[PDB]
Structure 1
């Protein structure tokens, strides 16, 4: 299907040390938020004790609480970039539109921390949230969510949940990375020029993984896991013109065939990253999809 017109315009107007690259990513997120301001939302900052150290979080409190599970949100950025502030535009909207409490997680970035450190942190924070939930007046089963690399983390946390005695009611995967081993058609065909590029993905992996063999570990490549039965209900949102599209959609099909309640939504004409790009109305459409999906959990 054609590229969305606003996406087309955005790609046409696109024009370092690690620190400079991280700063440039943050500046880009700020510019988009200046173009389309987030909704006001009450927040509280805190720090969770994990098995790998303190992890900063920010809890978002909706004006009106309508959803009975906490959400725990893991930002994207290739495992190397991003933070709570870069994803505030998305999380503020998830909070207020769903009417959910959301815990946004500042997990440890690569290459300073390597695989599987953030996976461990993200489990620990989910466990904390499940423990805290009743004192927030909520059910002790959590919803995990994330975009891109953060969607990878949400998927892995979900696969580990039973083994980790972690109660998870649903998983929300926004254009996740899920298979670092296999090339898919979308990975070949949309490899260059659609914001998320082949060269960058290679580099992100070099920063995150310890050795090349880690690509086949299921905590890096959750799509390789042979048994998906009994996993949490899943919303899998993809973008049509995204190298990661096909692995996302294939994982949704696999979940569905494993008896996992699954909703699979491709946003046509879109690119990777669209749910943190509020210049696109499809971002809010996708957040409405989240609210509608979560209405069905209880």
Structure 2
């Protein structure tokens, strides 16, 4: 095995051990226990968020979808008066509602100085694809009443990255204008692939062990029975959906199981002539930036804010 990456701050090295301590025990398919565990995990990261960042949050309903609107406590910045971001939370498509959503929205709202509308989308296994696309699209449609499409960004982490990419295709199915920019962080509209799922240990490899091929679909209940050929569901595997993608930020830890898929999606975006940016944080795991107590998380929030700042329009609307 490996020492921690020698690029990491002392604070990140501490976070790595806290991450290890916070890892889930085996649930053996007990969704109730699993949801309760991750509820507490997300509530814990929320407390850390609130210590670092000063925000105000309000509940709203937009086109019959529950959202939380997250803003810097004293107001959005003049630079971002006519912009908004939609956040789509992660949580394996089965949890993350409420505190998980605030944990992704608060650091970006506070770092960029922008309104973040985080969507309480329908979750699996009770709901299945394309429920979350429909929900995010309904919110987007409502926000178009106030903000130019060029000035709206959509981002999310892990499952939320996947749903962000699927929401783009659903928006185009509905005949609405595409968003100004997206962030598909730690996940996008494509299966995990390449080397990283083996290195990250999501699939066993090594002495005494037969390493299997990887799946061509995402294994989640959310995607049960959706075909590989559905370009709306898996747009980053489709040369057709890819060309219509808006400017995209892809960001992951270097040890994240999603990283090989993101580097491929970035190559495909570039060949399609789509503006895209990829950043990797060596040594860090999946969805590392839910832990705000390290310079590397603040840096990630700065890269997300800078990508939206440089790609979204400014004009009212």
| TM superposition score category, shorter chain reference | 0.7 to 0.9
CA distance in 2, matches of 1:233, 1:89: 24
Give the match for residue 186 of structure 2: 175
Q: Which residue of 2 is the match for residue 6 of structure 1?
A: 14
Matched-pair contact (CA < 8 Å) for 1:56–1:106: yes
Hey, what's the Cα distance between the residues in 2 that align with 1:79 and 1:230?
25
Map of 2:286 onto structure 1: 272
Give the CA deviation at 1:255. Answer: 0.9
- Higher-strand-fraction structure: 1
2:91·2:158 contact (CA, 8 Å) conserved in 1? Answer: yes
Query: In the alignment, which of 61, 76, 86 is matched to residue 64 of structure 1?
Result: 76
Q: Check conservation: 1:148, 1:273, Cα contact below 8 A.
A: yes
Deviation at 1:216, TM superposition (A): 4.1
Q: How far 1:207 sits from its partner (Å)?
A: 1.9
2:308 match: secondary structure: helix
Alignment match, 1:229: 243
2:164 pairs with 1:150: no
| Distance of 1:116 and 1:85 partners within structure 2 | 23
For the residue of structure 1 that corresponds to 2:183, the secondary structure is: strand
Select 1:243's aligned residue among 247, 253, 257: 257
* TM-score, scaled to structure 1: 0.84
**Residue of structure 1 aligned with 2:232, choices 215, 219, 227:** 219
The alpha-carbon deviation at position 103 of structure 1 amounts to: 0.5
5+ residue gaps, structure 1, are: none
Q: Which moved more, 1:277-286 or 1:99-108?
A: 277-286
Tell me whether 146-155 or 165-174 shows the greater mean CA deviation. 165-174
CA-to-partner distance for each residue in 1:122-150, whole Å, 9 max, x for gaps? 111111112233xxxx7774111110111
Change (3 A) 1:159 1:139: closer
Could you list the per-position Cα deviations for residues 206-253 of structure 1 after superposition, in whole angstroms to 9, with x for gaps in the alignment? 421232x53442233222111222421111112111111111121112
Q: What is the root-mean-square deviation of aligned Cα atoms in Å?
A: 2.7
TM norm structure 2: 0.80
The 1-side partners of 2:16 and 2:245 are apart by 37
In the alignment, which residue of structure 2 is the partner of 1:294? 308
Distance 1:290 1:20, change over 3 A: same
Q: CA deviation at 1:121?
A: 1.4
Q: What secondary structure does 2:243 align onto?
A: coil
Larger Rg: 1 or 2?
2
Paired residue secondary structure (2:62): strand
Number of aligned residues: 282
Secondary structure, counterpart of 1:292 in structure 2: helix
Q: Which runs of 5+ in 2 are unaligned?
A: 205-211
SS at match of 1:214: coil
The answer to whether the 8 Å contact 2:65/2:138 transfers is no
Q: What does residue 256 of structure 1 align with?
A: 270
Query: Deviations 1:20-46 (Å, cap 9, x if unpaired)?
Result: 211210101222333452523122211
Match of 2:88 in 1: 74
